[PDB]
Enzyme design. Structure first.
Site, mmCIF file in Angstrom:
data_model
loop_
_atom_site.group_PDB
_atom_site.id
_atom_site.type_symbol
_atom_site.label_atom_id
_atom_site.label_comp_id
_atom_site.label_asym_id
_atom_site.label_seq_id
_atom_site.Cartn_x
_atom_site.Cartn_y
_atom_site.Cartn_z
ATOM 1 N N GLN A 170 -10.774 -5.456 -1.081
ATOM 2 C CA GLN A 170 -10.126 -6.120 -2.218
ATOM 3 C C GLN A 170 -11.110 -6.250 -3.370
ATOM 4 O O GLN A 170 -12.348 -6.469 -3.166
ATOM 5 C CB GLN A 170 -9.610 -7.567 -1.879
ATOM 6 C CG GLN A 170 -8.598 -7.689 -0.697
ATOM 7 C CD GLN A 170 -7.314 -6.863 -0.927
ATOM 8 O OE1 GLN A 170 -7.055 -6.353 -2.061
ATOM 9 N NE2 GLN A 170 -6.468 -6.753 0.139
ATOM 10 N N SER A 200 0.783 -1.255 0.000
ATOM 11 C CA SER A 200 0.000 0.000 0.000
ATOM 12 C C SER A 200 0.817 1.308 0.000
ATOM 13 O O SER A 200 0.260 2.327 -0.325
ATOM 14 C CB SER A 200 -0.878 0.157 1.231
ATOM 15 O OG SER A 200 -1.946 -0.729 1.244
ATOM 16 N N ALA A 235 1.752 -3.336 3.172
ATOM 17 C CA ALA A 235 2.191 -4.721 3.326
ATOM 18 C C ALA A 235 1.863 -5.499 2.044
ATOM 19 O O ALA A 235 1.079 -5.056 1.201
ATOM 20 C CB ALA A 235 1.526 -5.362 4.568
ATOM 21 N N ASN A 253 -8.710 -0.934 -1.756
ATOM 22 C CA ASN A 253 -7.977 -1.071 -2.998
ATOM 23 C C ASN A 253 -8.897 -0.863 -4.189
ATOM 24 O O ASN A 253 -8.468 -0.229 -5.177
ATOM 25 C CB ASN A 253 -7.346 -2.465 -3.091
ATOM 26 C CG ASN A 253 -6.233 -2.595 -2.175
ATOM 27 O OD1 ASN A 253 -5.645 -1.585 -1.749
ATOM 28 N ND2 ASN A 253 -5.914 -3.829 -1.801
HETATM 29 O O1 LIG Z 1 2.998 -12.304 -1.312
HETATM 30 C C1 LIG Z 1 2.045 -12.569 -2.102
HETATM 31 O O2 LIG Z 1 1.917 -13.643 -2.790
HETATM 32 C C2 LIG Z 1 0.902 -11.506 -2.182
HETATM 33 C C3 LIG Z 1 0.881 -10.625 -1.132
HETATM 34 C C4 LIG Z 1 -0.093 -9.661 -1.027
HETATM 35 C C5 LIG Z 1 -1.069 -9.494 -1.982
HETATM 36 C C6 LIG Z 1 -2.069 -8.343 -1.745
HETATM 37 C C7 LIG Z 1 -1.339 -7.132 -1.080
HETATM 38 C C8 LIG Z 1 -1.881 -6.694 0.345
HETATM 39 N N1 LIG Z 1 -1.634 -5.250 0.626
HETATM 40 S S1 LIG Z 1 -3.004 -4.172 0.444
HETATM 41 O O3 LIG Z 1 -2.628 -2.837 -0.134
HETATM 42 O O4 LIG Z 1 -3.991 -4.929 -0.420
HETATM 43 C C9 LIG Z 1 -3.603 -3.895 2.055
HETATM 44 C C10 LIG Z 1 -4.881 -4.212 2.383
HETATM 45 C C11 LIG Z 1 -5.232 -4.004 3.677
HETATM 46 S S2 LIG Z 1 -3.868 -3.357 4.522
HETATM 47 C C12 LIG Z 1 -2.845 -3.378 3.132
HETATM 48 C C13 LIG Z 1 -1.396 -2.906 3.235
HETATM 49 O O5 LIG Z 1 -0.639 -2.923 2.234
HETATM 50 O O6 LIG Z 1 -1.080 -2.505 4.396
HETATM 51 C C14 LIG Z 1 -1.066 -10.406 -3.070
HETATM 52 C C15 LIG Z 1 -0.079 -11.428 -3.198
#
Ligand SMILES: O=C(O)c1ccc(CCCNS(=O)(=O)c2ccsc2C(=O)O)cc1
Length: 358
Positions: A117, A61, A315, A149
């Site tokens: 999502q 993010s 993350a 997102n």
């Molecule tokens: O390692 C992988 O295989 C993989 C990891 C994360 C994702 C989705 C990313 C999650 N980050 S985010 O923008 O969607 C999010 C959502 C709630 S908090 C947050 C963040 O980034 O802190 C897809 C694949």
């Protein structure tokens, strides 16, 4: 590396790594607008590659800050307005819940409860349209904030439409390239693979999976060096020679909405400095950061306030990062780690370091 920076960073990050079991980390401190770098541990455990100043991390993010600034730049270029209806740039969105939902709403997670999502079921452009056509708002537009997102994701894709460039092409040429972020990537190229750290999740090596609106919402990888440069460019947008870009950085740090102690910018979030660290620390935990919160409009938006703590956590399943800076103090920090560890831990570290240098 002034010994006092060294002192606070080491006394702060050493127990952070140890307690959170972080395999690798890079930290940049920007102090008096000059960067100082620190690296620990491994980019790749199996292959014993250390974290260096060239290692790529997945931003997650924190990618939304790039998005909010590429949006801001399209605003400054005359190409979009935040007061425009989502439908101006997507006439096929004809379902009538879209009535009244502007690009400000998409950008700031205020459209009325767009989900966190995009469903993994969505892979084609026709599927995505269908997804947004079918979506039923829980609230009227501009009443509640819900981190999403699917919301700022869609902002990013629509915002680049009048340019005629793909999102990645617009990002590269209007943002990465003028700022000389030459090792920052939406897609990591074969030549750069060797710098691309693995993320670690339950002790398994992973990388981010492809997904609808990934680039726009969580898909940037970057090095501690470019991320420091990124912080410096947002600390002092007036040293930026490119006018629409310098202006889009300003616009990303305007205050559009307030909830509790925080102000929603474009990608960035801001709090008045001096901030109460409990406020930013506790506020960073996900089920309070991800919760449905009522907003008050800032009518009209407060232009970028210098005495703010401006930050974003991000993350991926195998990475955790955090950026925070104080414009008025010329002070900032980047923390990139190839483990997703709790947000409070991140902000707690960042605040102890910036407080002591403050
Ligand atoms: O390692 C992988 O295989 C993989 C990891 C994360 C994702 C989705 C990313 C999650 N980050 S985010 O923008 O969607 C999010 C959502 C709630 S908090 C947050 C963040 O980034 O802190 C897809 C694949």
């Amino acid at each position: 590396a002034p010994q006092q920076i060294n002192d606070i960073v080491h006394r702060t990050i050493t127990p952070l790594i140890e307690q959170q079991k972080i395999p690798g980390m890079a930290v940049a401190v920007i102090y008096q607008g000059k960067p100082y770098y620190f690296t620990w541990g491994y980019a790749d455990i199996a292959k014993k590659q250390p974290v260096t100043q060239q290692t790529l991390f997945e931003l997650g993010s924190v990618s939304k800050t790039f998005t909010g600034v590429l949006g801001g730049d399209a605003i400054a270029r005359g190409e979009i307005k935040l007061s425009d209806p989502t439908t101006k740039y997507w006439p096929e969105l004809t379902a009538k819940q879209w009535n009244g939902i502007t690009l400000l709403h998409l950008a700031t997670y205020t459209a009325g409860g767009l989900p966190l999502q995009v469903p993994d079921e969505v892979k084609s452009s026709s599927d995505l349209l269908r997804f947004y056509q079918n979506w039923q708002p829980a609230w009227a537009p501009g009443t509640q904030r819900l981190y999403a997102n699917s919301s700022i994701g869609l902002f990013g894709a629509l915002a680049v439409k009048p340019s005629g460039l793909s999102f990645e092409q617009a990002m590269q040429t209007r943002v990465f390239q003028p700022l000389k972020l030459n090792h920052t990537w939406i897609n990591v190229p074969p030549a750069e693979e060797k710098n691309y750290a693995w993320g670690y999740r339950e002790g398994k090596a992973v990388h981010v999976s492809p997904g609808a609106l990934d680039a726009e919402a969580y898909g940037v990888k970057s090095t501690i060096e470019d991320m420091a440069r990124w912080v410096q460019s947002n600390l002092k947008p007036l040293d930026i020679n490119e006018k629409t870009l310098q202006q889009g950085i300003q616009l990303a740090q305007s205050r559009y909405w307030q909830t509790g102690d925080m102000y929603q910018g474009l990608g960035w979030e801001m709090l008045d400095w001096p901030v109460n660290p409990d406020s930013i620390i506790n506020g960073s935990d996900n089920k309070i950061a991800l919760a449905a919160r009522p907003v008050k409009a800032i009518t009209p938006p407060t232009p970028a306030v210098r005495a703010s703590w401006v930050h974003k956590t991000g993350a991926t399943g195998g990475f955790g990062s955090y950026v925070a800076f104080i414009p008025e103090k010329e002070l900032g920090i980047v923390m990139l780690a190839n483990k997703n560890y709790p947000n409070p831990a991140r902000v707690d570290a960042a605040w102890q370091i910036l407080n002591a240098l403050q």
